[PDB]
């Protein structure tokens, strides 16, 4: 159970996220819920990314790298798990208001 094998992930860690936790949680959720019923995560990416183009272009580095990782690791650990790990990647532990 890792997510460290891929260089895209470390780059996400480097950027610290800086994205809307709430929206990414929904992005991940949105592809997840589709992929739970469907079988093609690439296609699941298409809907959500085309629907949320504004945010996708906003955090294009983030959304490019995660889209790769999401598909890449869903086959290995599962999309549920990857989505959670991505949230973990954008979240600082507990030092926010006092950081």
PDB file of C-alpha atoms in Angstrom:
ATOM      1  CA  UNK A   1       0.000   0.000   0.000  1.00  0.00           C
ATOM      2  CA  UNK A   2       1.939   2.901  -1.344  1.00  0.00           C
ATOM      3  CA  UNK A   3       1.496   5.786  -3.764  1.00  0.00           C
ATOM      4  CA  UNK A   4       5.127   6.788  -3.783  1.00  0.00           C
ATOM      5  CA  UNK A   5       6.297   4.778  -6.764  1.00  0.00           C
ATOM      6  CA  UNK A   6       5.340   7.541  -9.160  1.00  0.00           C
ATOM      7  CA  UNK A   7       7.099  10.913  -9.748  1.00  0.00           C
ATOM      8  CA  UNK A   8       3.725  12.653 -10.492  1.00  0.00           C
ATOM      9  CA  UNK A   9       2.785  12.171  -6.855  1.00  0.00           C
ATOM     10  CA  UNK A  10       5.921  13.789  -5.434  1.00  0.00           C
ATOM     11  CA  UNK A  11       5.295  16.810  -7.643  1.00  0.00           C
ATOM     12  CA  UNK A  12       1.778  17.092  -6.152  1.00  0.00           C
ATOM     13  CA  UNK A  13       3.425  16.991  -2.735  1.00  0.00           C
ATOM     14  CA  UNK A  14       5.862  19.726  -3.854  1.00  0.00           C
ATOM     15  CA  UNK A  15       3.026  22.021  -4.931  1.00  0.00           C
ATOM     16  CA  UNK A  16       1.403  21.378  -1.505  1.00  0.00           C
ATOM     17  CA  UNK A  17      -1.927  21.221  -3.292  1.00  0.00           C
ATOM     18  CA  UNK A  18      -3.139  24.861  -2.889  1.00  0.00           C
ATOM     19  CA  UNK A  19      -6.441  23.701  -4.320  1.00  0.00           C
ATOM     20  CA  UNK A  20      -9.959  23.714  -2.968  1.00  0.00           C
ATOM     21  CA  UNK A  21     -10.280  20.651  -0.801  1.00  0.00           C
ATOM     22  CA  UNK A  22     -14.005  20.769  -1.202  1.00  0.00           C
ATOM     23  CA  UNK A  23     -13.975  20.926  -4.911  1.00  0.00           C
ATOM     24  CA  UNK A  24     -11.266  18.292  -5.403  1.00  0.00           C
ATOM     25  CA  UNK A  25     -13.148  16.045  -3.009  1.00  0.00           C
ATOM     26  CA  UNK A  26     -16.103  16.484  -5.334  1.00  0.00           C
ATOM     27  CA  UNK A  27     -13.970  16.026  -8.513  1.00  0.00           C
ATOM     28  CA  UNK A  28     -12.617  12.753  -7.147  1.00  0.00           C
ATOM     29  CA  UNK A  29     -16.094  11.799  -5.943  1.00  0.00           C
ATOM     30  CA  UNK A  30     -17.645  12.642  -9.270  1.00  0.00           C
ATOM     31  CA  UNK A  31     -15.264  10.424 -11.265  1.00  0.00           C
ATOM     32  CA  UNK A  32     -15.488   7.771  -8.546  1.00  0.00           C
ATOM     33  CA  UNK A  33     -19.270   7.519  -8.491  1.00  0.00           C
ATOM     34  CA  UNK A  34     -19.292   7.201 -12.277  1.00  0.00           C
ATOM     35  CA  UNK A  35     -16.496   4.624 -12.249  1.00  0.00           C
ATOM     36  CA  UNK A  36     -18.323   2.669  -9.558  1.00  0.00           C
ATOM     37  CA  UNK A  37     -21.209   2.145 -11.938  1.00  0.00           C
ATOM     38  CA  UNK A  38     -19.219   2.234 -15.132  1.00  0.00           C
ATOM     39  CA  UNK A  39     -15.848   0.591 -15.986  1.00  0.00           C
ATOM     40  CA  UNK A  40     -13.910   3.262 -17.841  1.00  0.00           C
ATOM     41  CA  UNK A  41     -12.200   5.805 -15.655  1.00  0.00           C
ATOM     42  CA  UNK A  42     -10.771   7.618 -18.686  1.00  0.00           C
ATOM     43  CA  UNK A  43     -14.300   8.321 -19.775  1.00  0.00           C
ATOM     44  CA  UNK A  44     -15.221   9.175 -16.150  1.00  0.00           C
ATOM     45  CA  UNK A  45     -12.380  11.767 -16.247  1.00  0.00           C
ATOM     46  CA  UNK A  46     -13.828  13.204 -19.477  1.00  0.00           C
ATOM     47  CA  UNK A  47     -17.235  14.099 -17.960  1.00  0.00           C
ATOM     48  CA  UNK A  48     -15.935  15.699 -14.830  1.00  0.00           C
ATOM     49  CA  UNK A  49     -13.051  17.531 -16.409  1.00  0.00           C
ATOM     50  CA  UNK A  50     -15.168  18.819 -19.284  1.00  0.00           C
ATOM     51  CA  UNK A  51     -17.889  19.774 -16.842  1.00  0.00           C
ATOM     52  CA  UNK A  52     -15.527  21.524 -14.422  1.00  0.00           C
ATOM     53  CA  UNK A  53     -13.232  22.976 -17.169  1.00  0.00           C
ATOM     54  CA  UNK A  54     -12.818  26.200 -15.228  1.00  0.00           C
ATOM     55  CA  UNK A  55     -11.292  24.512 -12.245  1.00  0.00           C
ATOM     56  CA  UNK A  56      -9.364  22.038 -14.400  1.00  0.00           C
ATOM     57  CA  UNK A  57      -7.617  24.858 -16.255  1.00  0.00           C
ATOM     58  CA  UNK A  58      -7.112  26.646 -12.909  1.00  0.00           C
ATOM     59  CA  UNK A  59      -5.102  23.865 -11.344  1.00  0.00           C
ATOM     60  CA  UNK A  60      -3.978  22.272 -14.600  1.00  0.00           C
ATOM     61  CA  UNK A  61      -0.784  20.904 -13.063  1.00  0.00           C
ATOM     62  CA  UNK A  62      -2.712  19.283 -10.297  1.00  0.00           C
ATOM     63  CA  UNK A  63      -5.524  17.981 -12.502  1.00  0.00           C
ATOM     64  CA  UNK A  64      -3.115  16.600 -15.104  1.00  0.00           C
ATOM     65  CA  UNK A  65      -1.024  14.729 -12.594  1.00  0.00           C
ATOM     66  CA  UNK A  66      -3.904  13.430 -10.530  1.00  0.00           C
ATOM     67  CA  UNK A  67      -5.809  12.255 -13.644  1.00  0.00           C
ATOM     68  CA  UNK A  68      -2.799  10.196 -14.563  1.00  0.00           C
ATOM     69  CA  UNK A  69      -2.364   8.829 -11.005  1.00  0.00           C
ATOM     70  CA  UNK A  70      -6.099   8.154 -10.538  1.00  0.00           C
ATOM     71  CA  UNK A  71      -6.312   5.821 -13.520  1.00  0.00           C
ATOM     72  CA  UNK A  72      -2.800   4.470 -12.955  1.00  0.00           C
ATOM     73  CA  UNK A  73      -3.383   3.517  -9.347  1.00  0.00           C
ATOM     74  CA  UNK A  74      -7.079   2.614  -9.555  1.00  0.00           C
ATOM     75  CA  UNK A  75      -6.049  -0.548 -11.378  1.00  0.00           C
ATOM     76  CA  UNK A  76      -3.596  -1.341  -8.554  1.00  0.00           C
ATOM     77  CA  UNK A  77      -5.124  -0.125  -5.245  1.00  0.00           C
ATOM     78  CA  UNK A  78      -8.586   1.071  -6.247  1.00  0.00           C
ATOM     79  CA  UNK A  79     -10.073   4.464  -7.066  1.00  0.00           C
ATOM     80  CA  UNK A  80     -11.561   4.800  -3.535  1.00  0.00           C
ATOM     81  CA  UNK A  81      -8.073   4.493  -2.135  1.00  0.00           C
ATOM     82  CA  UNK A  82      -6.406   6.772  -4.676  1.00  0.00           C
ATOM     83  CA  UNK A  83      -8.988   9.544  -4.171  1.00  0.00           C
ATOM     84  CA  UNK A  84      -8.448   9.383  -0.443  1.00  0.00           C
ATOM     85  CA  UNK A  85      -4.664   9.538  -0.902  1.00  0.00           C
ATOM     86  CA  UNK A  86      -5.024  12.563  -3.207  1.00  0.00           C
ATOM     87  CA  UNK A  87      -7.034  14.310  -0.470  1.00  0.00           C
ATOM     88  CA  UNK A  88      -4.284  13.408   1.943  1.00  0.00           C
ATOM     89  CA  UNK A  89      -1.761  14.956  -0.496  1.00  0.00           C
ATOM     90  CA  UNK A  90      -3.560  18.312  -0.589  1.00  0.00           C
ATOM     91  CA  UNK A  91      -4.156  18.399   3.103  1.00  0.00           C
ATOM     92  CA  UNK A  92      -1.744  19.699   5.610  1.00  0.00           C
ATOM     93  CA  UNK A  93      -1.952  17.613   8.789  1.00  0.00           C
ATOM     94  CA  UNK A  94      -3.582  19.904  11.467  1.00  0.00           C
ATOM     95  CA  UNK A  95      -1.581  23.098  11.339  1.00  0.00           C
ATOM     96  CA  UNK A  96      -3.678  25.441   9.265  1.00  0.00           C
ATOM     97  CA  UNK A  97      -4.934  28.313  11.371  1.00  0.00           C
ATOM     98  CA  UNK A  98      -1.666  28.233  13.184  1.00  0.00           C
ATOM     99  CA  UNK A  99       0.857  27.536  10.529  1.00  0.00           C
TER     100      UNK A  99
END
